[PDB]
Ligand binder design. Structure first.
Ligand SMILES: Nc1ncnc2c1ncn2[C@@H]1O[C@H](COP(=O)(O)OP(=O)(O)O)[C@@H](O)[C@H]1O
Ligand SMILES: Nc1ncnc2c1ncn2[C@@H]1O[C@H](COP(=O)(O)OP(=O)(O)O)[C@@H](O)[C@H]1O
Ligand SMILES: [Mg+2]
Ligand SMILES: [Mg+2]
Lengths: 371, 57, 57, 371
């Protein structure tokens, strides 16, 4: 039979059968209970709208993501999300399909063990396998080397790989991602008068960020230009009218990636954690990693980031090496495409964690040889 | 959707054209230096042979 | 109309990127050949100077 | 049929069919298992890359030479190297070709006996013969007398020969060679800030030594000059950029040959062990040995050694004798050229150790008349 390539993610759940080009169903991972009282009788009001249904009734819900930073903080809601994904968005019972979840690097063990225990006890799948979210993004590019920066919505991690041999001592995981950029944008919009507070209006700020923000090639020049002319002010229409005008908030929101001091984080930007991740590698594979830097994940879709990052790394790196940044147009679904490719391989067909194996060793089987 | 796709296509075409011109220049200079070096190598080999024969004598 | 324009731009972008990548690979090969030529030139130069000095002695 | 003139060496395996001018395949003798984990599936990752393949993937391997000082310390790896040499670099099955190995003087017997046992049992050659590495280097020079200093990469030995009669009591074998010079160079580079530690970076230090180091004609004058001017500082580009500048480390690395006290060895340099080897010979053949001093082996390729050695010996020797140092341009492959010449001789065709002879007397046949 065919395998189910699910990809929990944090912000958008992407799923679909193995062997295709794009995920079959992509929908936000939010579960929102209603918060008001409700007076109409017999309206058929449910107790929790999940997935894309709660992005249409969000006016009277309190949306809450069940995955904070890669890790899962609310297991009941995550179980509800998985149940919805299997039964309503794909309509395939899990009793007859292997599953291939994905997990960020350096995550707590208990999260992974609970994930496998749920998949084997509640949904009762035949066999499931958990894979690191960066190796798949490297599969999708058709490479076999390269250092991949997978800046998702929950957590940004940077896994270097050479000739198929991952370097476990050079993984640099940073917890700045799309959600913190949404919060920072929502915080700097208040400098013009627009106040978004409700958890429903966070979605509106996210839409503003997606449609308007861009990464500046040079920060100081843009700050000077936006403060003199008015060629940058782009307007946007809220879900009820009252258009708003975003000035130099456009390139200040995604600039936080390269200067995490804006949101008070100490660490260095995504332009310098990649160079540090390279320098921890051996001295003889640094040229190949320099030449095959891969971008993935949703947050790396800002217009103009593949040039800013290349300029920064070229500034840091030695002058002789060639710096090349692979930015495929299908960046958002790169991890899932790689997952489909991996699940479609014949050599991989014996790596699944078969159910009888789980019955013999318990949920701690995932840390064992079947990784 | 079409507007965004057009913008991204324009930017990609720009960057690809720039890289292509860079590659053409690199190929030209590489060929030039390669030919010069090969001629120098021929000269050096000829000189080596002549002086070796004279040394034996 | 916009869909047609976007598709045409996409096709042009893909073909130009492919040609640029192939010429870049060939340029890398040319650079390797140039490096080998440099090494050969240096080795032959050392040969010649050593032989000349020995002949003088 | 044609004979296979293999030459194990220590650092570069040189092989080729008898009767040619140069070895057909020359490649480092290193076998490196991968050391990291490896995440790509189906990449076709082998368990051990040998020969010249492991000098390209050396970034993720742990290269280890199977021959320490002439002697062989790891027989499985040496067998793997031989198998590679026969099947992939020459592509001739050994069942139809005699072999002519080479061995340093004064080596342990068990090494030679195990070598012949392997060649007769595993590879199943028709007949093999083991020859001393210095007599071949004397063949290649077209002489019949002379004292040959064969400073390889493993061990430096100095065999005097007169009129074809070797003098077994005058062989002076010293264990300083190219590898110790590489280690000493890697140890003195730390005085400028460059630290090479990994077994892969030993190859980079070896390349530095080959391309930059030279032997000073007079040591103290060079030490004084390099400490005042800056006309000696030659720069070199690492495999990733960050050029380095070598100062008076250039002529201090190969100076260890003439003053083995630098690396803590007690013995005298290669300039004085040759004179001692001569003085042990009889009083009537010392003039001929003085006039026909032969250099061979890789490590004697330093620019300016054929003059320093002549100056030193002229200082030691009596003033009347003429001191001449034969330094052919084909020094590196001198032993193998001599091996080809010896294997191509008709008079030598009955000295091979035929397989039936080995079956009758066991591996200890090599010490017998068939030397
Ligand atoms: N076109 C876009 N431009 C800018 N940001 C985007 C775009 N699309 C998605 N994002 C950001 O990326 C996030 C989605 O990232 P995604 O790759 O789905 O995360 P995950 O790894 O959990 O799947 C969204 O929250 C949004 O903030
Ligand atoms: N051109 C060169 N200049 C200086 N040193 C060299 C050069 N070529 C080789 N060497 C040294 O000689 C060694 C190779 O010696 P070689 O004669 O191959 O040893 P073997 O007797 O085991 O074959 C290398 O390890 C290197 O350190
Ligand atoms: Mg992701
Ligand atoms: Mg040798």
């Amino acid at each position: 039979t065919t395998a189910l390539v699910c990809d929990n993610g944090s912000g958008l759940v992407k799923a679909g059968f193995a062997g295709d080009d794009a995920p079959r169903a992509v929908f936000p991972s939010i579960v929102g209970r209603p918060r008001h009282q409700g007076v109409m009788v017999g309206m058929g009001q449910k107790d929790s709208y999940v997935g894309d249904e709660a992005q249409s009734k969000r006016g009277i819900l309190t949306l809450k993501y069940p995955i904070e930073h890669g890790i899962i903080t609310n297991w009941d809601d995550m179980e509800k999300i998985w149940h919805h994904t299997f039964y309503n968005e794909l309509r395939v019972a899990p009793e007859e399909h292997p599953t291939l979840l994905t997990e960020a690097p350096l995550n707590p063990k208990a999260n992974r063990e609970k994930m496998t225990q749920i998949m084997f006890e509640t949904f009762n799948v035949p066999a499931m396998y958990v894979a690191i979210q960066a190796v798949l993004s490297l599969y999708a590019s058709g490479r076999t080397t390269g250092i991949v920066l997978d800046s998702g919505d929950g957590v940004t991690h940077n896994v270097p790989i050479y000739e198929g041999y991952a370097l476990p001592h050079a993984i640099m995981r940073l917890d700045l991602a799309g959600r913190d950029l949404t919060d920072y944008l929502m915080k700097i919009l208040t400098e013009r008068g627009y106040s978004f507070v409700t958890t429903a209006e966070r979605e509106i700020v996210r839409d503003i960020k997606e449609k308007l923000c861009y990464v500046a090639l040079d920060f100081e020049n843009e700050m000077a230009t936006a403060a003199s002319s008015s060629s940058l002010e782009k307007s946007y229409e809220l879900p009820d009218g009252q258009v708003i005008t975003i000035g130099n908030e456009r390139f200040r929101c995604p600039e936080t990636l390269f200067q995490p001091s804006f949101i008070g984080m100490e660490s260095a930007g995504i332009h310098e954690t990649t160079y540090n991740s390279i320098m921890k590698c051996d001295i003889d594979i640094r040229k190949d990693l320099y030449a095959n830097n891969v971008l993935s994940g949703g947050t790396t879709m800002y217009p103009g980031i593949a040039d800013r990052m290349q300029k920064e790394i070229t500034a840091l790196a030695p002058s002789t090496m060639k710096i090349k940044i692979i930015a495929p147009p299908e960046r958002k679904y790169s991890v899932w495409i790689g997952g489909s490719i991996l699940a479609s391989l014949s050599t991989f067909q014996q790596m699944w964690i078969s159910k009888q194996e789980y019955d013999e060793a318990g949920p701690s089987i995932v840390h064992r040889k079947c990784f | 959707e079409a507007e965004k796709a057009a913008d991204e296509s324009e930017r990609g075409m720009k960057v690809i054209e720039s890289r292509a011109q860079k590659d053409e220049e690199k190929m030209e200079i590489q060929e030039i230096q390669l030919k010069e070096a090969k001629h120098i190598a021929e000269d050096a080999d000829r000189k080596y042979e002549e002086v070796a024969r004279k040394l034996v004598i």
